[PDB]
């Protein structure tokens, strides 16, 4: 679990979105595993606007943050779940690091701000859904 709070918006993994998130829906993209809902309070998280490939993510299954090198956002094949059939997920970045399904939503940050949230991982892997291209989050 985990979410980004910026302005009048809440960014969550689409597969973890609640009934409240869907009744206050602003935008969703199944191919990215992202959903954005509107909120009654103002958020102060800062979204990074950069091409950083290094940062730190929160891993809830270890109660720890880990520094990682991560790939550029791209279409990567992801295996099936009760949430999705096997498919290409877009705007996804991989790093070598620990992750388990309940780790989805943990934030990845660089010196410029929030980069994305955990959404994948594998055998050692871990994947992050990028949010840096969502320029409208700031306005
Ligand atoms: C086996 S480690 C791991 C870590 C994070 C996530 C997963 C698998 N997964 C993929 C998600 C997606 N983005 O399609 C949907 C929900 C889900 O459980 C495995
Ligand atoms: Zn950066």
- Paired tokens of 59: 């891993």
- Number of separate domains in the chain: 2
Same structural domain for residues 17 and 49? no
Q: Distance (Å, rounded) from C-alpha 139 to C-alpha 131?
A: 14
Same structural domain for residues 50 and 39? no
Hey, is 103 helix, strand or coil? helix
Catalytic residue among 21, 103, 104, 130: 104
Q: Which residues surround ligand 2, an ion (CB under 5 A)?
A: 48, 50, 52, 110, 112
Method of determination is: X-ray
Binding residues for Zn(2+): 50, 52, 110, 112
Q: Distance (Å, rounded) from C-alpha 44 to C-alpha 114?
A: 11
Same structural domain for residues 101 and 36? no
Q: Distance (Å, rounded) from C-alpha 125 to C-alpha 109?
A: 18
Same structural domain for residues 103 and 54? yes
Same structural domain for residues 138 and 116? yes
Same structural domain for residues 49 and 104? yes
Closest CA to 94 of 65, 60, 58, 121: 121
DSSP state letter for 70: B
Specify whether 44 is catalytic. no
Same structural domain for residues 75 and 89? yes
- Paired tokens of 107: 């934030």
∠ CA 72-43-138 to the nearest 5 degrees?
50
∠ CA 65-68-74 to the nearest 5 degrees?
120
Same structural domain for residues 112 and 49? yes
Same structural domain for residues 27 and 50? no
Catalytic residue among 21, 33, 103, 130: 33
Same structural domain for residues 23 and 79? no
Same structural domain for residues 71 and 98? yes
Q: Distance (Å, rounded) from C-alpha 88 to C-alpha 25?
A: 24
Q: Which domain holds residue 21?
A: 3-44
Residue 118 contacts residue 14 (beta carbons within 8 Å): no
Same structural domain for residues 115 and 65? yes
Residue 81 contacts residue 87 (beta carbons within 8 Å): no
Specify whether 15 is catalytic. yes
């Amino acid at each position: 679990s985990g979410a980004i709070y910026v302005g009048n918006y809440r960014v969550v993994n689409r597969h973890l979105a609640t009934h409240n998130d869907w009744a206050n829906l602003v935008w969703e993209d199944s191919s990215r595993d992202l959903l954005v809902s509107s909120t009654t309070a103002q958020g102060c998280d800062t979204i990074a606007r950069c091409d950083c490939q290094t940062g730190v993510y929160y891993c809830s299954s270890r109660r720890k943050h880990y520094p990682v090198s991560f790939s550029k956002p791209s279409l990567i094949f992801v295996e099936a779940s009760e949430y999705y059939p096997a498919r290409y997920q877009s705007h996804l970045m991989l790093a070598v690091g620990h992750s388990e399904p309940g780790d989805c939503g943990g934030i990845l940050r660089c010196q410029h701000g929030v980069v994305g949230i955990v959404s994948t991982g594998g055998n050692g892997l871990v994947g992050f859904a990028d949010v840096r291209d969502l320029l409208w989050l700031d306005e």
